[PDB]
Design a protein around this ligand. Structure first.
Ligand SMILES: [Fe+3]
Ligand SMILES: [Fe+3]
Length: 689
């Protein structure tokens, strides 16, 4: 069928034929009958695909990133697998291959002839240029990179460049006719091997290629031993020592398809069956991962064992990884712009209201703190993986996801204490907060033991006291993963907007975005949960202790908590009794870890540095708080930080999420999690890799 076939996109007659030989072998196996388009630019292929004129193609990391941009947004469908049948790996190393007997190092590269695989590609041009930057004498505003690189080398075949402006580059490029220095295998020195031919044929003093490149064009040592490698160590090594002598680790070439309505399924099925029948050493007739003698890397990357499935949730950007993304981005930013992104912290605001507060925070801070905004926490977390943000404050249950993704508790919010007026906040330990089940006193029938079939208000799907504790407890009493079945109706923003759990959620004044895991939805979070129990919409509210005192008895001016009588509420203890919120020192469901500031490791030190500055300006004893901007005061709407917070306190050592949340706790989250995985939870599992 038109969409039961996967039209694969070639970029050269030779590549074009390999596919058709594949079409024949894939037919007798009865599967998505592959279709095969032809073109000449690895870019034009991206166009066709994006233009629904093609389906998929395989691009090197660089390309992937490029392909993933707004003009045409493609997605890494499947990663290629490298290594050996027994030691598979999905990333590679960019290496500086040189000849033996050359008394030159990496810092002595000025004015020499170099060979690059292709423009933009990773190992062949990206990484090398990232390494050399310093010795580039680049005026980002006076000229491009191809500019300074041009004067940096005496001549280097760098296919895809425009010799017009920079000819000493394509100068060394083999092949005649303006056809020379092309961006498709059309150009002999273009590619991985093409870059070797370039150092083999005497054209350069060094070629930038992957680790096994040398090994693929020279099977007999005697031959290989005459090629060395350039360590960043400023020393040389044998091509067998790449693991110790390499420029950098980069992600493997993947195969992309369209972002939406992009035949992801038919492609993947088609990739596994091709792998099985013509994988590395499956048939002699046709070799999928091997290309015929003469040319190389046709279609897929030669000598690649298999394909690892990409979670339909990691975009180009997430795929490529954080560090590599950064190296890549910075290749379009001046040394001035990049040093700005480094020194400023970028909080991630969860919602339109919270984004508004950060904008203000930003402003008052003098622009030391800028804002990036997501529609949900899982989204702000994804964002931190993109280095597009820096940190944000997370609740226990959320830290988990963030912790599982590789983030780290930087500073923890500390509330007011009972003992010390001495030890200063930043230095005192967290006493954690209590989880409670609130209900209106005027409901004497309801007890912990009679909660089923009731309506419920939770802070949010996946929050500590709002969900993880309650469903944790209700779960080990039924062994059931079902939640659409314990409460006749409830409001747990986050969950499937069609389940009994989103029935009681209302949303903004206008009625939109019901059950949205951000303040937008009104019965959202610690306060929206209680507002929910207060308004009689549901029967018991699952929230933290102080939450009750914070909206009862004239503490909050929220026109819905104005008249609330504190005693008018009751806690549901676990015995099966109900107590008054005053004696909740013995009627809570459990102790939870304070929400804390997660962030990226490489930013941990910095973020914790800046926040100690901000907090000082607008916190309890701050200097610019009362009058200019109070960081922790949201008018009982708990934005950015818990109102009831006294300060961002430090934490001994470099604790991990498990060390912070709690193994016992962490396990409980894990188990409950077993009932369901997050698309961002799956992504990070693979990501971690
Ligand atoms: Fe590559
Ligand atoms: Fe919480």
């Amino acid at each position: 069928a038109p969409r039961k076939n996967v039209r694969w996109c070639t970029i050269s007659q030779p590549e074009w034929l390999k596919c058709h030989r594949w079409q024949w072998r894939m037919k007798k196996l009865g599967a998505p009958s592959i279709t095969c388009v032809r073109r000449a630019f690895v870019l034009e292929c991206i166009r066709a695909i994006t233009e629904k004129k093609a389906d998929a193609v395989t691009l090197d990391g660089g390309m992937v990133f490029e392909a993933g941009l707004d003009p045409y947004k493609l997605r890494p469908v499947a990663a290629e697998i490298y290594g050996t049948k027994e030691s598979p790996q999905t990333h590679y190393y960019a290496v500086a291959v040189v000849k033996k007997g050359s008394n030159f190092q990496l810092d002595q590269l000025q004015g020499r002839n170099s060979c690059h695989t292709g423009l933009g590609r990773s190992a062949g041009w990206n990484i090398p240029m990232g390494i050399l930057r310093p010795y580039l004498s680049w005026t980002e505003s006076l000229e491009p990179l191809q500019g300074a690189v041009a004067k940096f080398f005496s001549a280097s075949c760098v296919p895809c460049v425009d010799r017009q402006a920079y000819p000493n580059l394509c100068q060394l490029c083999k092949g005649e006719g303006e056809n020379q220095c092309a961006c498709s295998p059309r150009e002999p020195y273009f590619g991985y091997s093409g870059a070797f031919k370039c150092l083999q044929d005497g054209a350069g003093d060094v070629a930038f290629v992957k680790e096994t490149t040398v090994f693929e064009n020279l099977p007999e040592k005697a031959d290989r031993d005459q090629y060395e490698l350039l360590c960043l160590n400023n020393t040389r090594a044998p091509v067998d020592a790449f693991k110790e002598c390499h420029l950098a680790q980069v992600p493997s070439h993947a195969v992309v398809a369209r972002s939406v309505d992009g035949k992801e399924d038919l492609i993947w099925k088609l990739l596994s069956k091709a792998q099985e029948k013509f994988g590395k050493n499956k048939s002699g007739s046709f070799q999928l991962f091997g290309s015929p003698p003469g040319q190389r890397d046709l279609l897929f990357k030669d000598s690649a064992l298999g394909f690892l499935r990409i979670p339909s949730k990691v975009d180009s950007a997430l795929y490529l990884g954080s560090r590599y993304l950064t190296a890549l981005k910075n290749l379009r930013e001046t040394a001035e712009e990049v040093q700005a992104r480094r020194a400023r912290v970028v909080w991630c605001a969860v919602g339109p209201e919270e984004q508004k507060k950060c904008q203000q925070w930003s402003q008052q801070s003098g622009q030391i703190v800028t804002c990036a905004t997501a529609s949900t926490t899982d989204d702000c977390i994804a964002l931190v993986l993109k280095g597009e943000a820096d940190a944000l404050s997370l609740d226990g249950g959320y830290i988990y996801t963030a912790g599982k993704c590789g983030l780290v508790p930087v500073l923890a919010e500390n509330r007011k204490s009972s003992k010390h007026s001495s030890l200063d906040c930043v230095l005192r330990p967290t006493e954690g907060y209590l989880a409670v089940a609130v209900v209106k006193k005027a409901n004497e029938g309801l007890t912990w033991n009679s909660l089923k079939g009731k309506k419920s208000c939770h802070t949010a799907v996946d929050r500590t006291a709002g969900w993880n504790i309650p469903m944790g407890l209700i779960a080990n009493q039924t062994g059931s993963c079902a939640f659409d079945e314990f409460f006749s109706q409830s409001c747990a923003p986050g969950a499937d907007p069609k389940s009994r759990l989103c029935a009681l959620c209302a949303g903004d004044d206008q009625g939109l975005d019901k059950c949205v895991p951000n303040s937008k939805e009104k019965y959202y979070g610690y306060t929206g949960a209680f507002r929910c129990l207060a308004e009689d919409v549901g029967d018991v509210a699952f929230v933290k202790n102080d939450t009750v005192w914070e909206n009862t008895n004239g503490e909050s001016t929220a026109d819905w908590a104005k008249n609330l009588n504190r005693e008018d509420f009751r806690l549901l203890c676990l015995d099966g009794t109900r107590k008054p919120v005053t004696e909740a020192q013995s009627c809570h469901l459990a102790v939870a870890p304070n929400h804390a500031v997660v962030s990226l490791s490489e930013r941990a030190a910095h973020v914790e540095q800046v926040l100690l500055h901000q907090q000082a300006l607008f916190g309890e004893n701050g200097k610019n708080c009362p009058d200019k901007f109070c960081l922790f005061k949201s008018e009982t709407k708990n934005l950015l930080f818990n109102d009831n917070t006294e300060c961002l306190a430090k934490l001994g050592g470099r604790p991990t999420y498990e060390e912070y949340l709690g193994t016992e706790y962490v396990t409980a989250i894990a188990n409950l999690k077993k009932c369901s995985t997050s698309p961002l939870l799956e992504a990070c599992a693979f990501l971690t890799r």
